[PDB]
Design a protein around this ligand. Sequence first.
Ligand SMILES: NC(=O)C1=CN([C@@H]2O[C@H](COP(=O)(O)OP(=O)(O)OC[C@H]3O[C@@H](n4cnc5c(N)ncnc54)[C@H](O)[C@@H]3O)[C@@H](O)[C@H]2O)C=CC1
Ligand SMILES: NC(=O)C1=CN([C@@H]2O[C@H](COP(=O)(O)OP(=O)(O)OC[C@H]3O[C@@H](n4cnc5c(N)ncnc54)[C@H](O)[C@@H]3O)[C@@H](O)[C@H]2O)C=CC1
Ligand SMILES: NC(=O)C1=CN([C@@H]2O[C@H](COP(=O)(O)OP(=O)(O)OC[C@H]3O[C@@H](n4cnc5c(N)ncnc54)[C@H](O)[C@@H]3O)[C@@H](O)[C@H]2O)C=CC1
Ligand SMILES: NC(=O)C1=CN([C@@H]2O[C@H](COP(=O)(O)OP(=O)(O)OC[C@H]3O[C@@H](n4cnc5c(N)ncnc54)[C@H](O)[C@@H]3O)[C@@H](O)[C@H]2O)C=CC1
Ligand SMILES: Cc1c(N)cccc1Cn1ccc(OCCc2cccs2)cc1=O
Ligand SMILES: Cc1c(N)cccc1Cn1ccc(OCCc2cccs2)cc1=O
Ligand SMILES: Cc1c(N)cccc1Cn1ccc(OCCc2cccs2)cc1=O
Ligand SMILES: Cc1c(N)cccc1Cn1ccc(OCCc2cccs2)cc1=O
Lengths: 237, 237, 238, 238
Amino acid sequence: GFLSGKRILVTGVASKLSIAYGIAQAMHREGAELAFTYQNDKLKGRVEEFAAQLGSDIVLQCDVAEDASIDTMFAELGKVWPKFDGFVHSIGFAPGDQLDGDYVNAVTREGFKIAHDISSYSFVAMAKACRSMLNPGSALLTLSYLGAERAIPNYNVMGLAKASLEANVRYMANAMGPEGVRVNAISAGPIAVTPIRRTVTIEDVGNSAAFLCSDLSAGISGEVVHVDGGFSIAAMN
Amino acid sequence: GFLSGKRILVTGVASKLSIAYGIAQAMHREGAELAFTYQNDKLKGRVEEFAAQLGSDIVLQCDVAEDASIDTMFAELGKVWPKFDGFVHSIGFAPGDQLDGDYVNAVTREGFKIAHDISSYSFVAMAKACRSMLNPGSALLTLSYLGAERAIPNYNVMGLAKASLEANVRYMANAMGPEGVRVNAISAGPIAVTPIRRTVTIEDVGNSAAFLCSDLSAGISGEVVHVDGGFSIAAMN
Amino acid sequence: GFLSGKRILVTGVASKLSIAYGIAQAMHREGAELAFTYQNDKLKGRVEEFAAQLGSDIVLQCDVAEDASIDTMFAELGKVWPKFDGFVHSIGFAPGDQLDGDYVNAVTREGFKIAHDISSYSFVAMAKACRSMLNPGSALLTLSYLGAERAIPNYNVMGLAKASLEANVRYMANAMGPEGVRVNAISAGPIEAVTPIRRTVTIEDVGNSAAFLCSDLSAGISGEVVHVDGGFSIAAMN
Amino acid sequence: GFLSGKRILVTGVASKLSIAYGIAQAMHREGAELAFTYQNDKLKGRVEEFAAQLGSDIVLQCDVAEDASIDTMFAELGKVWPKFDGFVHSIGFAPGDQLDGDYVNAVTREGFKIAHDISSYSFVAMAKACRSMLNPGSALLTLSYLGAERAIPNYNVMGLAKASLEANVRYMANAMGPEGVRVNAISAGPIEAVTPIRRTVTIEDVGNSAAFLCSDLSAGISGEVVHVDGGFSIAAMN
Ligand SMILES: NC(=O)C1=CN([C@@H]2O[C@H](COP(=O)(O)OP(=O)(O)OC[C@H]3O[C@@H](n4cnc5c(N)ncnc54)[C@H](O)[C@@H]3O)[C@@H](O)[C@H]2O)C=CC1
Ligand SMILES: NC(=O)C1=CN([C@@H]2O[C@H](COP(=O)(O)OP(=O)(O)OC[C@H]3O[C@@H](n4cnc5c(N)ncnc54)[C@H](O)[C@@H]3O)[C@@H](O)[C@H]2O)C=CC1
Ligand SMILES: NC(=O)C1=CN([C@@H]2O[C@H](COP(=O)(O)OP(=O)(O)OC[C@H]3O[C@@H](n4cnc5c(N)ncnc54)[C@H](O)[C@@H]3O)[C@@H](O)[C@H]2O)C=CC1
Ligand SMILES: NC(=O)C1=CN([C@@H]2O[C@H](COP(=O)(O)OP(=O)(O)OC[C@H]3O[C@@H](n4cnc5c(N)ncnc54)[C@H](O)[C@@H]3O)[C@@H](O)[C@H]2O)C=CC1
Ligand SMILES: Cc1c(N)cccc1Cn1ccc(OCCc2cccs2)cc1=O
Ligand SMILES: Cc1c(N)cccc1Cn1ccc(OCCc2cccs2)cc1=O
Ligand SMILES: Cc1c(N)cccc1Cn1ccc(OCCc2cccs2)cc1=O
Ligand SMILES: Cc1c(N)cccc1Cn1ccc(OCCc2cccs2)cc1=O
């Protein structure tokens, strides 16, 4: 398929409902060889079982809160994949207390710090940590949401962390372009007033993700692609 | 390939350098069955030779300046393709006098009229003319340029016609979504300060176009996808 | 006020409810000298009286469908204002049949043609015709709507025309900046429980932002579409 | 002028060249009563004298890295202004090492942390701390740069921080609108042969747009990032 030849690392698999699960299934269908990270001991067994079903046995621990964790993960990867063709960053977090009601009242310095650190900084931290490992023609991808661009009730500080992440996509694309690396995002709909009259699925997101990490999207970099059924471009439906 | 099963009509082939040529080659590689239009008698033989090389013998006249021409073309198509899965609108024109120097001095009412009529109205005119022919899961695509969003010297009134066209994409996506039809655009780079450090090719544009007309992009509608190497998202490089 | 010493032409005053009427009121309040156009003879009476109360007896017919009407109008203005400081373009039209239901079924070539001609082309048509009459420091302004940027039901082909109009703003700004002219738009809210200021905007609000945009207070702003909609466009699922 | 009857707090006045200095000058010219903060003791002297000439003896230390300094500052302001009408946030910082060359090589977790904390979080931190002191009709304003929206060489992690800041504007606007507060940003040009007005913008230009944005003249505008860059961002390959 249109990923045959490619070796792609997939973060963020936590359950069958994860966007990263949908992405991994699509990329495997299109012939990618896959590797996976897991955040912690809670998630290890689930990610091992899924990796095995997709024919992979590269499953490595990575907490993107820790620079040493990301470095150690990329040294372990380099033992089997001395070079590879990019990664899917499907990692987001804000403390639950941030998401409760009026934005100005809910936000705190620490909640802001954490949401930005995990949801935005970790994307470039990963790119720093593997930069010399990336083949020419590599592609990096991250997942964002319409909260980056609009004020969405309760989404709160995650909207700022997503706006930072989309700026990260542009700064990364511009910095790494000259070495043959593309960096994009998908702004996914939540997983009626939507033009396609349904919600998007992890299968929809997975197909677009596969495209965006493949040579088919050679022309596209620094872009935030809306995979939300047309929701964001409509009003008053 | 990822278009097998699909029947797609391709407008705008005028030479081997045409974007539509690149699109047709990619879509044929991915297993689409193709049909072609040609504007006039000048272009007929070239489009017949290309259609034949891609295994098609559906080559029909269409001047999108004329409602009768578009209707007659879709009746001729309906004789071989009573239903089909969308079309590639790769048709743009402004009189050459519009493109010469200061925008306010160059523009005229007639040049404005023509550039909008041919470059923007014709996309929805085509959709009107075939609407009951489109299968659920159909996709329409048009080509736009960064002149829609920025003031680009000499591009002049074509920039307004492109801004109208991108609004047409959104209005069309929203109107036709409920019958299972997606409508998108590609904002292509012109065929250094570009992140990928080259210009995009009709092969790049063709691959993205193929994706955008295929079921792989099921999640994407009313979108203007920048296929310009990251140019539009950079500044002061 | 902050438009003292400025001469501004205001189009599109049709009644007291007109956006152009709130704009004229605010610029008059702020000390501008005003001139007015009307579309056709039916409006001549009313626009003559609205002008009077805004200190003006300059009231000129102008149908922006016709190049010669634009030229005749600026020739007449030139007899009293051989130089002036800009104009407010508050003119839009699409045939009623264009706005009825599904956009792909309703739009026609002729509807699309007229909408774009009257709501977008006319802005630059007026600039062409008065370009040599503008002082350095001049400002042009037009009115747009969110329908340029989003698919809004029933707004239909008028959304395409407004998208064309906002690109017109950028191309006119870029062309005319070097000679000392700025060009902007206000994207006005319609004239609400999910608007951040929790009310609809008024012609007073739009008037005050328009006065700013045509004054030297906004010397650093050109080619910009300023949203004067109470924050409606930046919110979602409120 | 058009800010008579308003009380506005201005942060970030560091010298005569400061954007905050041009803003304070314009709001003072237009009749606002002003109060000022300074970051640390080094600046105390100078900000006391800048305040004096802008009719103010309200000059308070505030380091926005610290919640307690923000709280102490608003407690002190409250002794003289128990209510006021908004503030100008003109505070940005990233460590110098962040801005040197290639962005992926230069950025660090700590640089990213401080940039976002000081340039984006502090805006909302100040709003939280004074929310009950604001009158209906209040306006908050911050300063952004094109680096939020585009990848600009060397601007590096500060572009991410400004993107965070412009989303902050929208979320703060949406949260605070119902109680009668607006929140906006000015995306200023740097303080040129391809700028449509063919000059760089000055702190005077930015000052005048800021005065507008904090006055009742802009009652219809919230959650908006207004480009005060002479049209630079809307042009390409000029
Ligand atoms: N679910 C939705 O509706 C949408 C989600 N998104 C984004 O998609 C991405 C994936 O979200 P989902 O799959 O829905 O949920 P999820 O909860 O399945 O996945 C989030 C993942 O982040 C990982 N993660 C969190 N902190 C981490 C850390 N310190 N180190 C390493 N990994 C860490 C978790 O282990 C988990 O695998 C996120 O960035 C989210 O913001 C975007 C649009 C819509
Ligand atoms: N060439 C470039 O750098 C870029 C081009 N575009 C757009 O891509 C599209 C295709 O352009 P190109 O392939 O470069 O050039 P082209 O000249 O190969 O194709 C334009 C086509 O439009 C057709 N056309 C014009 N008026 C017509 C009418 N009345 N009825 C039917 N067909 C008509 C011509 O026959 C020709 O096939 C256009 O819409 C153009 O604006 C977009 C971005 C960059
Ligand atoms: N009312 C609303 O909700 C909003 C209106 N707008 C725009 O503001 C502008 C003014 O609209 P309104 O004041 O609401 O309605 P209006 O009906 O008072 O003003 C429209 C004006 O355009 C004039 N006009 C029409 N065709 C013309 C022609 N051929 N020649 C000369 N003048 C012509 C009419 O005579 C009338 O004065 C329009 O551009 C409109 O699209 C923008 C946002 C919201
Ligand atoms: N100078 C320029 O080209 C542009 C600047 N901006 C923005 O305008 C704002 C002001 O910048 P400028 O006046 O140019 O420089 P400046 O150096 O005069 O102002 C920056 C101010 O931030 C204050 N500050 C820094 N850290 C702080 C902290 N922890 N606590 C309290 N105050 C703190 C400094 O004391 C100083 O007053 C910034 O947000 C900047 O990013 C926006 C567009 C262009
Ligand atoms: C992982 C995480 C955490 N820890 C906190 C908030 C959000 C998320 C992920 N997520 C989850 C759902 C989502 O839904 C978009 C629709 C929404 C709008 C307002 C609230 S949710 C977007 C989205 O980003
Ligand atoms: C078919 C046509 C006609 N008749 C008139 C103008 C433009 C075009 C097609 N075209 C061709 C080239 C193009 O180049 C983008 C770069 C440019 C910028 C300024 C002028 S050209 C974009 C683009 O749209
Ligand atoms: C003068 C004119 C004509 N002839 C036809 C349509 C629109 C207008 C002016 N107008 C008037 C109202 C307006 O309301 C925006 C809200 C809407 C949304 C969908 C339909 S109206 C926008 C707007 O542009
Ligand atoms: C106070 C501060 C610190 N500590 C570090 C970086 C930037 C700034 C303020 N500033 C100053 C100049 C500026 O210029 C925009 C033009 C640029 C483009 C690339 C690098 S500067 C934007 C801008 O934000």
